[PDB]
Amino acid sequence: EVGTVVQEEMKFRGSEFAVKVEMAERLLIVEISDVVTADQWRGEFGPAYIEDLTRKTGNFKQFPVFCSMLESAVHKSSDSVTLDLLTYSDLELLRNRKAGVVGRPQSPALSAKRYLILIYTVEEARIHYPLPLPYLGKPDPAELQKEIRALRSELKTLGL
Amino acid sequence: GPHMEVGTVVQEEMKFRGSEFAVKVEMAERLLIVEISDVVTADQWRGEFGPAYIEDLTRKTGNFKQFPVFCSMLESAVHKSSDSVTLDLLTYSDLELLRNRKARAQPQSPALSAKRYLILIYTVEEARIHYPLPLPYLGKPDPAELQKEIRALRSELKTLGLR
């Protein structure tokens, strides 16, 4: 069976995005779509990556705990977790602000990528876990129409 | 009397001359809506037809049908629920060749080239009557609009889970 999916729309630095998170026992999929342009970014994450990422960020979390935190953030179901969406440049700035450092190229793919930041509140502190999301481009009309037909048919079935 | 209810939508996939198409027929108020999508290319064609149009078309074709009767026939054809009706999908060229075969330069325009005709083929006795529905070409759909639709469908399915 397919893993647990949550998806909600929200605004990040001036624009509206759809945020989709799919969770399985050892797999986290994050898919973000610009609602207006249909641009998409997507990352897939396993336990080792996630557990390494949380450590490097400064506050280790086990893979299923991290995923539950992300789920709550998409649902806006806990004050302790929120989200942001950053370019590489903005994440560098954030890294510099957090380290109290002043602050000093970028490939096409790097400029195009985005980072979903899971922002976790502990005490009065904020911990910014960055999930890198490679740019996918825009999706295919034939493929989307296929999905649409399937969804309508399921609506049609369950109705009867 | 037979009729398609306003608000009803029938959509089924079927093959025309070896290729897969999605065939959608919707009943709006006094308006028959027919939309066809190439499953592989996402090309779309759509036409809308009122009562007077259909009654005139069926008469010109050689066998008058009242608008609601015609609508229910087409509905039955998409469902493939009746042996008396079947469907074909043709280009202007196809339609012109078959017209000549039954018993010269042709008009040429971008619109004419790109158009399709859904043929409602009705059998009575051993006679076959071919009602041609002209469907102007729309082009391919917009990804952002399709994604919007997908999110709305998923949300609705989710609320259906509560029942």
Numbering used by the authors:
A (entry chain B): 2 to 105, 110 to 165
B (entry chain A): -2 to 100, 107 to 166
What did the original publication write about this model?
The highly conserved coiled-coil domain-containing protein 61 (CCDC61, also known as variable flagellar number 3, VFL3) is one of these understudied proteins. Here, we identify CCDC61 as a highly conserved paralog of SAS6, a key organizer of the central scaffold around which centrioles are formed (Leidel et al., 2005). Our crystal structures of CCDC61 demonstrate that it adopts a SAS6-like fold and forms oligomers through two homodimerization domains in a similar way to SAS6: an N-terminal globular head and a parallel coiled-coil domain. Further analysis of CCDC61 reveals that its coiled-coil domains are capable of directly interacting with microtubules.
To further confirm higher-order oligomer formation of zCCDC611−170 in solution, we subjected this construct, as well as its F129E/D130A mutant that disrupts the head-to-head interaction in zCCDC61, to size-exclusion chromatography with multi-angle light scattering analysis. In this experiment, the His6-lipoyl domain tag of each construct was retained to stabilize the corresponding proteins at high concentrations. The results shown in Figure 2D demonstrate that the wild-type, but not the head-to-head dimerization-deficient mutant, was able to form higher-order oligomers beyond the coiled-coil-mediated dimer.
